[model samples]
Target: NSVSVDLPGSMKVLVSKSSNADGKYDLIATVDALELSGTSDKNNGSGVLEGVKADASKVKLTISDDLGQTTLEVFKSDGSTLVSKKVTSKDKSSTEEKFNEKGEVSEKIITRADGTRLEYTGIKSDGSGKAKEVLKGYVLEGTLTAEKTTLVVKEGTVTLSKNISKSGAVSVELNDTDSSTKKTAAWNSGTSTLTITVNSKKTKDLVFTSSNTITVQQYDSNGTSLEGSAVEITKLDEIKNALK
Candidate 1:
C-alpha cells in the first residue's frame, strides 16, 4: 500500500509499504517533496533587485536504504546535479563535488580524518586531475628596503628560511596594453630604496633616510640623475594602498 499527503505549507510527504500474502506488512520508503511555482506550495519568500531575480521552490528531502552506495544529491529545475556528496564503505572519506551549468565537475574537495584538506582544480580533458597542498599556521610579513637611498623589493614569495625582519624584496609590474607603457616597482631593504622603472628606460628612485622624509630623484633613460630631491610624505599608508 502507498499513501501520499500534501501538507498545507506546500510540502508533501509520501509513504509506501508492501504486504505479503499472509498480511504481514513491511515499510518500503518515505519521502518529502515540495513544489516550486504552484498553489499547493505557497510562496513564503521572494525578491528581485534590479535585473537580478531570486526565489526558492520545489525543494525536496529524501532517505533511501536500497541505494547501494549511500549518496545524496541536490538537483536544479532542469534535473541537472547541483551538489552531491557520497561516502563509500571502502575509503570512508566523504567527497563532495559541485557541478557547473554544463554538468561538468567544477570543483571537488576531499577531507581526511587527520584534518588535512586536498583541493583539485584545472580540470583536464580526462577524468583525472591535479591536486595542490595548502599550507597552514604561519606568520607572514612584507618589507620594502632601499640601497644608497633607493627603494626596491627584496622578496615577494614567502619561505621559512627567508622570514627575516626587514629583508626580502617584492616587485610589481603594471603594463598598459593599449598605451604600451610599463611600470615596475621593487623594494630592497639592503639599499633602502624604492626603485621604479618606466618604459624600460627611465628610473625613478625614492631613498628612505628617515621615517618622515624620502630622497627622490628622476633619471632619464640613459641613467643620469641629480643628487637629491627631498620630499616629506606623512601618509605612507596611501602609497601601500595604491600599489595594491
Candidate 2:
C-alpha cells in the first residue's frame, strides 16, 4: 500500500529489487523529486533526504528524513493489471418505475387504447411454506392499483387468504371482444385477493406482444350483490355495476 525512503546524497537515485515478490532490494531506481529536512550545515549536508518508489504502479513511498514529510503510493507485486466491472443504472421518471409482484410497490397500471387498464393478479402459496406463485401474469388496474398506486373506485377486490380464500375467482380471457377464437386462462381467487403485477416475457431478441387473458365475471366475485342468471346484462356492464 505504501512505503518509505530516505537519501542524503546528490547521488542519482535508483530502485533495485530482486525478480520475485520475496526478492531482495539491490538495483538503483531513478526518482523524480527529492526533499531535504533539518538544518543545512556549512557543508549543506545536515538535512534529511527523501524519495518515493521508482515504479508508482508497483510501489509508493514516503520519507521523513530531514526532508520534512512525504507520502508515496505503491502498487501490488508482479506488475499485473486488474479490471473491475459493474452494472450502472440511469434515473427514471415516476411512470418508468417497474412494478414487481410481491415487491414493496404492490401494483402498477398502464392504459390501453380502449382507455381500460389490465389489472395484475397477486397469487401466493399458503404461509405454511414459502410463498408460492399464484397470480403469475397479471397487471393492476384502477381499483387493482389502488393499494400501491391510487384509488378511484367505490369498491374492489380485497385480499383474503393467499391460495385459499372466500373471494370470488378471477380469470382472463383471450380475444374476449371477439365471439370467435376465445380461450380461458387459468386463474384462482380467495377471500383476500392478492395484488396484480406485470410479467415481462423477453426470453430472446425476437419481440412479440405477449398475451395474458383475464377471467371476466358476469357477477361480482364477492357476493356484495346477487345477480341471477336470468339477468341479460353484458359482462363489462356487470363488472362496472358490481364495483359501484
Candidate 3:
C-alpha cells in the first residue's frame, strides 16, 4: 500500500547540543534531519519540496574548546551511552621548552574506519608539519538508534485534534532507520518551520484525547538535545499550518 524502501540513501542527522547542566530539551541540531532522499526530479522547479523521512541510527557528538582536551561521546536510541573518550596530545617541543628544550617535537592523532581514512590530522599548531594538522577538538560518530522522548500529550478529544493533523501531502521513507513497515511523515508550515510525528507504542496506551501536551520545539533530533521544561498544546490551525 506504500513505498517502503530506498537503496541509494544516506543517514541524515541533526546534532543539537547545549552547555546546560541537564540535557532534557529539544534543541534542533541541523536545519534538516540527516538523509539523502530520492532526488529523481532534481529539475522540477518548485518551492521548498519535502523529502522522504529518515531517522539517524547512530549519533556521535564531539565537543571541546578546540583545544587538546577534546571529548567524544557516542549514543544509541536503545538507551545506551558510550563513555566519554578523551584524547590529549601536547606538542613535545613546548614540553621541551619547559623541561629540556631538545630536538623538534610534535604529536598527531586521527580516526580511521574499515581501511578507509575517515579522519586524520597532526598535532603541531604551526602549519609546518609534514603530516595533516589535527584540529584542536574531537570527533564522535556511529550507527545506533537515538533516543527521543515523547514531547506532549492531550487530555481531551477536542484537544487531541489540536496537535495532530492528516496531511496527505506529507511523505516519509521506511528505509530510514531500518527495513521497517512504517515511514516518518514530516509536516511543515513553511520552509524554516517543520514538525514530525511517529506513532509510538512505547508510551502507555492512553486515550488520544486524555493525553498530554508540549510546546512545539525545534530540536527533536537523535544525538543532542535542547533545554526546557514548559509543555505546550498546539492549536488545530497551528497543526495545519505547521505541517503546511
Candidate 4:
C-alpha cells in the first residue's frame, strides 16, 4: 500500500511503504544537509525528511518574524528535495541548501534580488563521503568541543592544513606549485575587512574601515562629491546566515 501527504510550500511526501520502493525500508534522522529539488521513490530525499516526523509524517515546525521579513524552516518538504533548515531574506535575497547522502551540507545556493546567483558545495573531491572519522569517545557532553585540531584536506595536487580555535577562529592554507593561494574573508557590524591573497601577486581587497554601508563615491565635474547610492547592511544576519 502507498500513502501520500502534502505539507506547506507545496511539499509532497510519501509516508508509506509499497511496491514502488525498490530499496530497504529504513528511515533515520540526523543530517547537516540534503540535495536540491530532487526526488526518489524511497531511500531518497522525501523519505529522509519525512522520517523526522516519526513514521514518515510532515514538517515538524516552521518560524517567521513579526514583520515577516525573515523566515526559518526546519526539515521542510517540497516537490523538490527536503532541506534541513532554511533561511529566506525577503526582497533582497533567498537561500536554498541541501544535505548529501552522508548527511552533510553539500550545496548552498544564494540568489540575489538583482538576479545574481551563487552556490557552494563542499565534498570529497574524489566523489567520496565521510572519508574517515577518528578520535572519538575522548570526552562526553551535549556537544563535543574539538581542541587543538590539525586537519589536512587534499584536493588533487594541493593540500590544505586547517586549524580551528576555541574562540571561533579558523586559518587554512593551500599551497600549489603554480597557484598558491591563501584566501580569507571576515565581516561584522563595525569596521570590517575582507582580504583574499592568491599567489601573493594577484591580490584583491575590499574593506569597510569607516562605515558599514557600501556607498558609491564619485567626483562630479562641478568640484563636488555627489550622487548617492546606499548598499546599506539593513540585514547583516540575513546575508551571513544564508552564506553560512
lDDT leader: 1
* Candidate 2 least-lDDT 10 residues: 201-210
Worst 10 residues of 4 by lDDT: 135-144
**C-alpha-based local distance difference test score of model 4:** 0.36
Q: Please state the error at residue 3 of candidate 4 in Å.
A: 30
Writing each residue's lDDT as its tens digit, candidate 2 over 1-244 gives 1123333221232333223344333223244543312221222112222232334334323333343333332223443431111111111111111223222222222233333343333422221111121122322232222222222212233121212122423332111222232211222223211122112211111001122122322323442333343232233334334322
In order, candidate lDDTs are: 0.38, 0.26, 0.24, 0.36
What is candidate 1's lDDT per residue for 126-161, written digit by digit as tens? 444444322232111332122211122222221111
Over 28-119, each residue of candidate 3 has an lDDT whose tens digit, in order, gives: 22213533222121122111112222332233322222322222222333324332222323321111010112212232233221111112
Candidate 1 vs candidate 3: the TM-score winner is 1
Deviation (Å) of 220 in candidate 4? 18
Once fitted onto the true fold, the runs of candidate 1 whose alpha carbons sit more than 4 angstroms away are: 1-69, 81-83, 86-91, 122-130, 134-244
Cα displacement (Å) at residue 80, model 4:
18
Alpha-carbon runs more than 4 Å astray in model 2? 1-147, 150-152, 155-213, 218-238
Candidate 1: lDDT over CA atoms? 0.38
Candidate 4, after superposition: displacement of residue 77 in Å? 10
**Each prediction's TM-score against the native?**
0.29, 0.16, 0.15, 0.27
How far residue 62's Cα lies from its native spot in candidate 4, in Å, is 1.9
